[PDB]
Amino acid sequence: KLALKTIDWVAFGEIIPRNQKAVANSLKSWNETLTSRLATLPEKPPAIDWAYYKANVAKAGLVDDFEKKFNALKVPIPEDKYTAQVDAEEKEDVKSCAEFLTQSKTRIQEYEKELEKMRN
């Protein structure tokens, strides 16, 4: 079972600069593609009627050999060598997060200070 950070798409639409809409588009479709994909690609494949094959063979314990070999062959799960995003994120927080937010707050302060005066 997978974890999958939930996602509201209209927000995602609203955070991409225009010069980057391209990327964002491809990112969306891949997701959709990928999703469709998993809907159709089953967790595991059909089993294998070993008895039947054992029932119709000719080379001796080929089937026995194979059933054994099949089971307790552990297929590797692919390394996630791909989360450099975590990094590209933390980076854009240096950027977006703090820097902008800090300045926005300060501007909201002065505005407020400016409404202060005007009350008197």
Binding site: L2, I7, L41, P45, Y111
Partner: protein, 105 residues
């Protein structure tokens, strides 16, 4: 008499710019706040889409690997049957020709 009118119209004009500024500034306190709220939640989603994409792509891959092992083994198995089947047919085919050639003798 005029003393008043110019001054008064002056005095109104003022508070007319005052109310105006005041709306315009509070509208801006407002925008700023929306800008923020957005950069907040908002921005992470981009990276979340990306991380999600990865997760899936590995799953598909894992699954595909599994399917491949199946197809390939089964494929090796089915080969033996298809072969066996071909032999029989050919052997059989041959027998009938052996028969007629002999009975029509």
């Amino acid at each position: 008499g005029e003393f008043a009118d110019k001054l008064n119209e002056q005095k109104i004009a003022q508070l007319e710019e005052v109310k105006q500024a005041s709306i315009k500034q509070i509208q801006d306190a407002i925008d700023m706040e929306k800008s923020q709220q957005a950069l907040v939640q908002k921005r992470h989603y981009l990276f979340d889409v990306q991380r999600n994409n990865i997760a899936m792509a590995l799953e598909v891959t894992y699954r595909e690997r599994l399917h491949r092992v199946y197809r390939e083994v089964k494929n090796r198995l089915d080969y033996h049957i298809s072969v066996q089947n071909m032999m029989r047919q050919k052997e059989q085919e041959h027998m009938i020709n052996w028969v007629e050639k002999r009975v029509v003798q």
